């Protein structure tokens, strides 16, 4: 039901359909991933029983494109800790690969202790080796939502 409502939201955001009885969408998308959208669109009209193809036209406007970052489960926390201040411009040098090392390193020069270096990671190894059963739970307090 929430997938059906989600498609019904973006089709409200689609064309005003005064051109024809067809819906026009001018969407942003990465150029490295332009073949997988076409292999999804060629099977998109295939389940509807139709034979006419959906086509993908590239425009040449001067509208500012959004920024996007390839992101694992590991490098997600370091990515949105940079974007909490300000999200970068289009094709700017991303600080987040360098922030992955130097931000725990600058944390370690001002919080440096072998005893608390044991307790800080043993609290964290417990949160990554047992993370399967924690994603099974819905939500907890923000001392276990923001920390997790």
């Amino acid at each position: 039901v929430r997938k059906m409502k989600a498609i019904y939201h973006t089709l409200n955001l689609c064309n005003i359909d005064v051109t024809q009885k067809c819906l026009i969408a001018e969407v942003w998308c990465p150029v490295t991933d332009l073949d997988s959208i076409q292999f999804a669109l060629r099977r998109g009209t295939e389940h509807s029983g139709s034979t006419v193809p959906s086509i993908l036209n590239r425009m040449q406007t001067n509208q500012t494109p959004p920024t996007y970052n390839k992101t694992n489960k590991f490098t997600y926390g370091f990515q949105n800790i940079v974007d909490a201040y300000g999200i970068g411009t289009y094709r700017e040098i991303n600080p987040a690969p360098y922030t992955i090392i130097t931000f725990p390193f600058l944390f370690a020069v001002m919080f440096g202790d072998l005893g608390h270096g044991i307790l800080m990671t043993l609290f964290a190894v417990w949160m990554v080796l047992r993370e399967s059963r924690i994603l099974s739970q819905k939500n907890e307090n923000e001392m276990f939502s923001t920390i997790f």
Binding site: T19, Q20, C22, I24, I55, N57
Partner: protein, 54 residues
């Protein structure tokens, strides 16, 4: 753009159905105006028995 080629192609498809709705409102008066040909043609159908009984 491709929308400029489809905004004119849909106009040619909308004008073709607008002309077909105009011909159905033109032959409607011709439906009874040609049905009034039986005042001139089906009167001779009564002339078939007009010489039979005489």
């Amino acid at each position: 753009q491709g929308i400029q080629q489809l905004l004119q192609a849909e106009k040619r498809a909308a004008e073709k159905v607008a002309d077909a709705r105009k011909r159905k409102a033109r032959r409607l008066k011709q439906a009874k105006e040609e049905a009034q040909m039986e005042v001139d043609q089906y009167r001779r159908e009564r002339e078939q028995e007009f010489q039979s009984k005489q």
